[PDB]
Amino acid sequence: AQRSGLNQIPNRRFTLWWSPTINRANVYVGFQVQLDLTGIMMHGKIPT
Amino acid sequence: XXXXXXXXWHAPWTLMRVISGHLGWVRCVDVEPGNQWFCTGAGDRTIKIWDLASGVLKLTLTGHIATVRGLAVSPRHPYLFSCGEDKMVKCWDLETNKVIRHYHGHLSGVYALKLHPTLDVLVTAGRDAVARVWDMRTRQNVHVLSGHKSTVASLAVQEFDPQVVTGSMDSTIRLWDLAAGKTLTTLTHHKKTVRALSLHPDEFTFASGSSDNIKHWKFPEGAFMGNFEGHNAIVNTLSINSDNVMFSGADNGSMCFWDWKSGHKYQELQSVVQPGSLDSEAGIFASSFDKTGLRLITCEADKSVKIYKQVDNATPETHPNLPWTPSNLR
Amino acid sequence: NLLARQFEGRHSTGVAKQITKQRVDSHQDLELRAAVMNDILDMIPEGIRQGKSKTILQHLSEAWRCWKANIPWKVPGLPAPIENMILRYVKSKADWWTSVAHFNRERIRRGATVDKTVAKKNLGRLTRLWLKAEQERQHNYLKD
Amino acid sequence: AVVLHEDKQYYPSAEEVYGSNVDIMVQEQDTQPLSQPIIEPIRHKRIAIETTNVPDTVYKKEFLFGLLTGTDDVRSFIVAG
Amino acid sequence: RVTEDGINQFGNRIRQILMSSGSTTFTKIANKWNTALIALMTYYREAAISTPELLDLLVKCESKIQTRVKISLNSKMPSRFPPAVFYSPKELGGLGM
Amino acid sequence: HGELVQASFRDLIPLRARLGVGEISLEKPSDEQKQEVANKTKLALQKILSKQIAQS
Amino acid sequence: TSSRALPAHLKLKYRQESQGTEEEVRKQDLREALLRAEAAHFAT
Amino acid sequence: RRWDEDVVFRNTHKGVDDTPRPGFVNDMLRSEFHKKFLARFVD
Amino acid sequence: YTRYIDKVYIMFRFTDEESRDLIQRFLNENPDPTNSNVVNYSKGKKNCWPRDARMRLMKHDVNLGRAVFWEIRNRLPRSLTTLEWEDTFPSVYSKD
Amino acid sequence: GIEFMDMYSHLIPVYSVDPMEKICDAYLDQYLWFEADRRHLFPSWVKPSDSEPPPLLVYKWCQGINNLTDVWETSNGECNVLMETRLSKVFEKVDLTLLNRLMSLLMDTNLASYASAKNNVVLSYKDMSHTNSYGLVRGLQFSS
């Protein structure tokens, strides 16, 4: 289970670099919860 | 008086049909009140439907996950039941040909499946070491017949007291109060696992079988009647006829037909066994007559149903039943 | 339903587990290894000690294992009765185990299944079922 | 002489094991597919409305036969358009 | 045309991809999908395009592969998705597919 | 409920030889008991089934 | 208690008069219908 | 019929028919079904 | 004629004389009373093509191929290979 | 050792040969092919050859069906039959004895011994294995 998570390290960056177009209302008809200690908003869960 | 009593015809059977169909051991048969089709709960997890007359397929009612152990058609309702080594108990509606009800409650592989005659009620039993009595309609267990201490490997059901007859690895038998959920008698005269019961059509009597003395009993008290003696194998089946003929098939293929008045067995047969099979293969887990009392239908470990029909000519001259005689001992 | 759990707690250990796909292969066996515990008990006469009941099984299994491998399974003096017991209750297994490698190679041909597990298992079961029958095609070429 | 592996039939015909007066039935495929019940359900085929019993109506029924049988009161026609 | 085989043959070269990679990189999955699908359209070139049967895999299977990625970011399944993310070239942070 | 329980060797003795037996009855009782019993059982199950539905 | 233990099929289905009532089986002579069916299958 | 004269073999597949396909077998591994199932899903 | 590993491709051409002989000779070796030769010629192989383009089944055409298959099958010994009806499909181009 | 590479439609046996034998075999493979084409052993019609890839084959075989003399004339009872076939099980049916003799022709008697010998082998997978006398094995570098 660790080696699976470790092969998906490079994968994590990819999310960052497209975060602005991924994390929006039109892509996820989700519950918009504000992330804590910040002014940002996560629309999905998108844990990566 | 004991030796005097024991001194006190019926024609020979033959192979008529080999229905090669299933792909695992047939562990069950039930023939349908109208005498036109019968069922064979195989270990392909498939109930199949055969024609008495032609011996042809009809249905393949799939819906189990492990050897369909029991089966039972009810006459009063157009239902068919089944059981297995799944804990599953089903109600196959015959008009639609699908399942309607599950009867959940059994903790492990169920073997016995038999339908009370009056009261809409269903009795099943297995290795939970208990016979469960189910309520047809509201799919809800009424009774836990708690007593035996092992696999309740057989059941039989009647209208009058002793309405419920168990039989187990305990090498015992109880007779049951369906109202109270407690045992009347406690009949221990077997020495090993009771792999059969069966009620006589009219007589008011029930033969209990096994790999020991194929015993044979009375009622309410049950008090012993006699021993059919001569079967040297492990016997699974005690099928009774209307014209006082038993049939006992064993795990060798040894098929001895008996006579209910005396005790004398008048026939013995090997099972012969299908082409690809092994020699050990031969066996007989289940078998029964028609409602007429004219046919014998079997369930062999050859992965096959075979049908035995009496010969046409008959007559003591053109048959010769085996010899009866008197001697000492007890 | 949740309140009753909160002012009672869960009932006695049992209820009923209701099979499912995860626990079918296990519960199949459990029954077979208690329908041989039956048939022995009755095959053994009326006083020959019960130190075999459990003992018979470790053959059964080894027999089964032996089949899958295709190695023969001669065994030094054991009762010709109990040789057959075990040749018979193996033959059963070897159906419901072949059967399935049929039935799942035709839920893959089609598309239905996924998750390696099943496409991994029913690739094994074939690879045996096929080696079994590339063995016979050799033996029955030097003999024939 | 040479029996090629394809043919090499190991076991004996299902007949010659009994092979005479016994019926050897090989039954793989079903007949009468699932849809067909098995215990036929009663089914009253009805096309059109009809009244179980006569509906009661002002003029008595004998008087309708009186007219129909007795006299030239009766007419008949076709309503069309 | 494309025979009935080479349709279902290709329809599996993809199912193979989605088993092997139980847990791998997004960059690599794309990289298998591009070899698969160049090798399909560089052999059957003229025919490939001329059948309907192939060209309603090539849609559904391209979607199967996106839906792999699509899932490994989030479970609730995007109503739509931005197509730049998939088709934009690698040198701008794309998969290249 | 122990009056049917066995005790003597007599109990292993067949009914054809008990010695002290008038007649052996093999007939299957009657209809007016059949309908008494069926009433007794069916009333009993119903009082139980009702009380099961109450707790369920 | 669960989902599966809810009210369902509160009605049983007793045998209608044509499809196989137990009384019609008594008047039926099973014996002769059996033999005649075997002869037909055999002849074909 | 000079083309059929040159063939170094002759009516080989001459009596190719019948087979035990009718004969049911109680041996799942040595049926015909199974011989087709392994015929198809391999090579 | 060409062989690609385990696949064989052949191109025949017949005059009415030879076509007559070949069909007759095959038909004589194995008679055709029932006329089931048209039933199992195709196994739904060319159903991808339209019904227009699909090969038509005349009594003459069917028997031509069926026979060519039978003729060629015999030229190989049954101990080195076989041929098979399912794994083959000869297309008959004629007047029809 | 023998291992099955799955495709969900039809399996494939795959042959794990030892590392040194492969270097030898691979040399051999390359050798016969270089030398056979240096002296034109093979005809034209044996065709997965170095000239055409498979789609150009199809073109060049439709280009040939038009460049026969008077192909499309169905005037006076002419008839074309174009047949395509699969030799069911050629790789199973092959023997080594016959192969050994046939082989002995094409090359030196010492090389041909290698090939024939190479094919015998033991096949292995998990609990089981067997010899391979009858069949022809493809894993070899020169099995083409």
Its sign, for the CA torsion C18, C24, C29, C31, is positive
Which chain H residues are closer than 8 Å to I75 by Cβ?
A: 7, 9, 12
Q: Give the per-residue SS3 of chain E.
A: CCCHHHHHHHHHHHHHHHHHCCCCCHHHHHHHHHHHHHHHHCCCHHHHHHCCCHHHCHHHHHHHHHHHHHHHHCCCCCCCCCCHHHHCCHHHCCCCC
Residue I88 has a CB neighbour count (10 Å cut-off) of 17
Residue B287 belongs to what H/E stretch? strand B284-289
Decide: helix, strand or coil at residue E66: helix
Single out the residue of B283, E67, B45 nearest to residue C99, CA to CA: B45
Coil/strand/helix, residue B176: strand
Chain H contact for D77, CB < 8 A?
A: no
d(CA B247, CA B295): 11
User: What is the rounded distance in angstroms from the CA atom of residue F7 to the CA atom of residue B172?
Assistant: 16
The amino acid that residue I62 corresponds to is: V
Q: How far is CA E7 from the centre of its chain?
A: 14
Q: Do E79 and A7 lie within an 8 Å CB cutoff?
A: no
Q: How far apart are CA C121 and CA C125, in angstroms?
A: 6
C129·H28 Cβ contact <8 A: no
- What is d(CA D43, CA D14) in angstroms, rounded to the nearest whole number? 45
CB spacing of F15 vs B186 below 8 angstroms: no
Q: Which residue bears the tokens 């074939």?
A: C126
I79: contact with J, CB 8 A cutoff: yes
Q: Is A2 an 8 Å CB contact of chain E?
A: no
Please calculate the CA angle J56-E7-E95 and round it to the nearest 5 degrees: 95
Instruction: Report which of J46, J44, J133 is spatially closest to residue J97, judged by C-alpha positions.
Output: J133
B33 in Cβ contact with B24 (< 8 Å):
no
Preferred mutation among E14, E15, E16, E61 to probe C, highest tally of C CBs within 10 A: E15
Nearest to G14 among B35, B54, B77 (CB): B77
The CA distance from B42 to the nearest CA of chain C, in Å, is 12
Which subunits sit against I, judged by 3+ Cβ pairs under 8 A?
D, E, H, J
**Amino acid of residue C72:** P
CA-to-CA distance for G29 and G22, rounded, in angstroms? 13
Alpha-carbon span C123 to E11, nearest angstrom: 19
Distance CA C75, CA C72 (A): 10
Rounded-to-integer distance, Cα B46 and Cα B59, Å: 10
Sequence ranges of the binding site of D for GTP: 81
| Residue B128: burial class (beta carbons within 10 Å; 0-12, 13-18, 19+) | buried
Is C144's Cβ below 8 Å from some Cβ in D?
yes
Q: How far is CA I42 from CA B241, C117, I38, I53, in A?
A: 55, 38, 8, 14
Residues from chain E contacting residue I48 (CB–CB below 8 Å)? 1, 4, 53
What is residue B299's three-state secondary structure?
Answer: strand
Q: E9–J9: do the CB atoms touch at under 8 Å?
A: yes
**Contact of H23 with D14, CB cutoff 8 Å:** yes
Dihedral of the alpha carbons of J81, J82, J84, J90, in degrees to the nearest 10? 70
Per the CB < 8 Å rule, is J83 touching I72?
yes
Whole-number Cα distances in Å, H11 to E36, I26, I77, I88: 47, 12, 9, 20
Alpha carbon distance E74, E62 (integer Å): 19
What is residue B167's three-state secondary structure? strand
| Method by which the coordinates were obtained | cryo-EM
Q: Tokens for F8, please give them.
A: 């003597």
Return residues 8-67 of D near C (CB < 8 Å). 8
Using CB atoms, list chains with 3+ pairs below 8 Å to chain E: A, C, I, J
Distances (CA, A) of F7 to B186, F10, F13, G29, I74: 12, 8, 12, 48, 85
Nearest to D15 by CA among H30, B18, B307, B303: B18
Pick from B315, B276, B284: nearest CA to B9: B315
Amino acid of residue C29: D
Residue of B nearest to D25 (CA): B19
Identify which of E27, E73, E80 has the shortest CB distance to residue A46: E73
What whole-number distance in Å separates Cα of residue B28 and Cα of residue B285?
A: 7
Contacts of residue C130 in chain J, CB cutoff 8 Å?
4, 11
Contacts by A23-31 with C-beta closer than 8 Å and gap 24+? A26/E79, A26/E80, A27/E78, A27/E79, A27/E80, A27/E81, A27/E82, A28/E74, A28/E76, A28/E78, A28/E79, A29/E79, A30/E76
SS3 B4: helix
**Burial category of D33 from C-beta neighbours within 10 Å (exposed 0-12, middle 13-18, buried 19 and up):** exposed
- The Cβ-side half-sphere exposure at J82, using a 13 Å CA radius, reads 10
Could you tell me which chain D residue has the CA closest to the CA of I82? D6
- Chains H and G contact (Cβ–Cβ under 8 Å for 3 or more pairs): no
| Contact indicator for B277, G19 with CB cutoff of 8 Å | no
CA atoms within a 13 Å half-sphere pointing along the CA-CB vector of G8: 12
- CB-side neighbour CA atoms (13 Å) of J62: 5
The token pair at E75 is 């479970």
Residues of B with Cβ-Cβ distance to C43 under 8 angstroms: 211, 234
In order of start, what are the domains of chain B with their CATH numbers?
A: 16-310 (2.130.10.10)
User: Which residues of chain H make contact with I67, given a CB cutoff of 8 A?
Assistant: none
Task: Tell me which chain C residues have a C-beta less than 8 angstroms from the C-beta of B283.
Answer: 88
- Gap between the Cα atoms of G21 and B77, Å rounded: 9
Please indicate if any CB of chain J lies within 8 Å of the CB of E50: no
What's phi and psi for B234, nearest 5 deg?
-95, 110
Residue E24 amino acid letter: T
Encoded tokens for C18: 């209701």
Give the residue from C27, J123, I74 showing the smallest Cα distance to H11. Answer: I74
Determine contact: C42 vs chain B, CB below 8 A: yes
- Residue whose C-alpha is closest to residue C92's, from B65, G8, E89, B67: B67
B268, B255 in Cβ contact below 8 A?
yes
Spatial separation of the C-alpha atoms in residues H38 and H35, rounded to whole Å: 5
Question: In sequence order, what are the beta bridge partners of B38?
Answer: B31, B50
CA-CA distance, C104 to C118, in Å (whole number)? 8
Distance CA C70, CA C66 (A): 6
Residues of J in contact with H40 (CB under 8 A): 10
Asked if residues B177 and B187 have their Cβ atoms less than 8 Å apart, the reply is no
Task: Give the distance between the most distant pair of CA atoms in chain D.
Answer: 102
H helical segments located in F1-56: 31-55
Verify G-E touch: 3 or more CB pairs within 8 A: no
- For residues B88 and B64, the answer to whether their CB atoms sit within 8 Å is yes
Classify burial at G22, counting beta carbons within 10 Å of its beta carbon; exposed 0-12, middle 13-18, buried 19 or more.
Answer: exposed
Chain B residue numbers touching F48 (CB-CB < 8 A): 142
* In the block, residue with structure tokens 């329908």: C35
Dist CA F5 CA B177 (whole Å): 15
Count of Cβ atoms closer than 10 Å to residue I79 Cβ: 12
Tell whether B277 lies on the interface with H, counting CB pairs under 8 A: yes
Question: Tokens 């038998």, residue?
Answer: B173
Question: CA–CA separation, B311 vs E7, rounded Å?
Answer: 62
Chain-chain contact of J4 with C123 (C-beta, under 8 angstroms): yes
The two structure tokens encoding residue H11: 């009516």
Point out which residues pair with B235 in neighbouring strands.
B250
- Best of G13, G17, G19 to substitute, by most chain D Cβ atoms within 10 angstroms, is G19
After which residues does chain E have a break in its backbone, defined as C to next N over 2.5 Å? none
Q: What is the 3-state secondary structure (H, E, C) of chain J?
A: CEEECCCCCCECEEECCCHHHHHHHHHHHHHHHHHHHHCCCCCCCECCCCCCCHHHHHHHHHHHHHCCCCCCCCCCCCEEEEEEEECCCHHHHCCCHHHHHHHHHHCCHHHHHHHHHHCCCEEEECCEEEECCCCCCCCCCCCC
Q: Which residues of A touch E73 (CB under 8 A)?
A: 15, 22, 46, 48
* β-strands D23-26, B15-20 pairing: parallel
Residue D24 and residue D15 in contact, taking contact as beta carbons nearer than 8 Å: yes
Residue among B282, F50, I4, J64 nearest C87 (CA) = B282
Q: Do H19 and D7 touch (CB under 8 A)?
A: yes
| CA–CA dist I45, I50 (Å, integer) | 12
Interchain CB contact of B303 with H (< 8 Å) = yes
Annotated binding site of D: 81
In Å, how far is J6's CA from the nearest CA of chain C?
7
For residue H27, list chain D residues with Cβ-Cβ distance below 8 A: 11
D48 contacts chain I (CB < 8 A) = no
In the block, tokens 């989902």 appear at G3
* Residue D20: C-alpha distances to residues A32, B15, B17, J12 (Å): 82, 10, 11, 46
What distance in Å separates residue B285's CA from the closest CA in chain D?
21
Measure CB to CB from residue C138 to each of J2, J8, J133 and give the nearest one.
J133
Task: Write out the H or E segment, with its range, that includes residue C69.
Answer: helix C57-69
